[PDB]
Amino acid sequence: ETLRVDPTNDRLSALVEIYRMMRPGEPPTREAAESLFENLFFSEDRYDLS
Amino acid sequence: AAAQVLSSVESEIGRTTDPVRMYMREMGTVELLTREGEIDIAKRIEDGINQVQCSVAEYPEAI
């Protein structure tokens, strides 16, 4: 049901949707969205609990 | 790449009142012309200034 509701097709559309959700009112670009997705969670100096 | 960007932004904005995003959208439509646009703009400005100077010279009351 989640796949049926989700209209995205590939990773690019997913990154575009994530970038539009994070900061709306901004045109989504591939490089900036990829950098944001890599720095929000896949960053050692930014994402590390204990 | 101007109309599609504006349409996508207007369809994505959920009544957002952020002036920074509005300014970035208003300034993001115009692209850059490096080493070729500023020179033409300056040349057109100088041509307009020369036209104004010629119009003033044809108007002897200013002199």
From Swiss-Prot, chain A:
Role summary: DNA-dependent RNA polymerase (RNAP) catalyzes the transcription of DNA into RNA using the four ribonucleoside triphosphates as substrates.
Subunit structure: The RNAP catalytic core consists of 2 alpha, 1 beta, 1 beta' and 1 omega subunit. When a sigma factor is associated with the core the holoenzyme is formed, which can initiate transcription. The rRNA transcription and antitermination complex (rrnTAC) consists of RNAP, NusA, NusB, NusE (rpsJ), NusG, SubB, ribosomal protein S4, DNA and precursor rRNA; S4 is more flexible than other subunits. In pull-down experiments interacts with CedA.
Gene from which the chain derives: rpoB
Family classification: Belongs to the RNA polymerase beta chain family.
Domain of life assignment: Bacteria
Coiled coil ranges: none
PTM comment, free text: Acetylated on several lysine residues in the presence of glucose.
Biotechnology: Co-administration of salinamide and rifampicin or salinamide and myxopyronin suppresses the emergence of resistance to both antibiotics.
Entry protein name: DNA-directed RNA polymerase subunit beta
Curated annotation (Swiss-Prot), chain B:
Residues of the full protein shown: 79 to 141 of 613
Signal peptide: none
Subunit note: Interacts transiently with the RNA polymerase catalytic core formed by RpoA, RpoB, RpoC and RpoZ (2 alpha, 1 beta, 1 beta' and 1 omega subunit) to form the RNA polymerase holoenzyme that can initiate transcription. Identified in a complex containing RpoD, the RNA polymerase subunits RpoA, RpoB and RpoZ, CRP and DNA. Interacts with Rsd; this prevents interaction with the RNA polymerase catalytic core and with promoter DNA, and as a consequence, promotes transcription from promoters that require alternative sigma factors. (Microbial infection) Interacts with Escherichia phage lambda antitermination protein Q.
Coiled coil location: none
Name the record gives this protein: RNA polymerase sigma factor RpoD
Taxonomy, superkingdom: Bacteria
Source species of the chain: Escherichia coli (strain K12)
Task performed by this protein: Sigma factors are initiation factors that promote the attachment of RNA polymerase to specific initiation sites and are then released. This sigma factor is the primary sigma factor during exponential growth. Preferentially transcribes genes associated with fast growth, such as ribosomal operons, other protein-synthesis related genes, rRNA- and tRNA-encoding genes and prfB.
Transmembrane feature ranges: none
Domain remark text: Contains 4 domains, connected by flexible linkers. In the active conformation, the domains are in an extended conformation, each making extensive interactions with the RNA polymerase catalytic core.
Annotated localization: Cytoplasm
Homology family: Belongs to the sigma-70 factor family. RpoD/SigA subfamily.
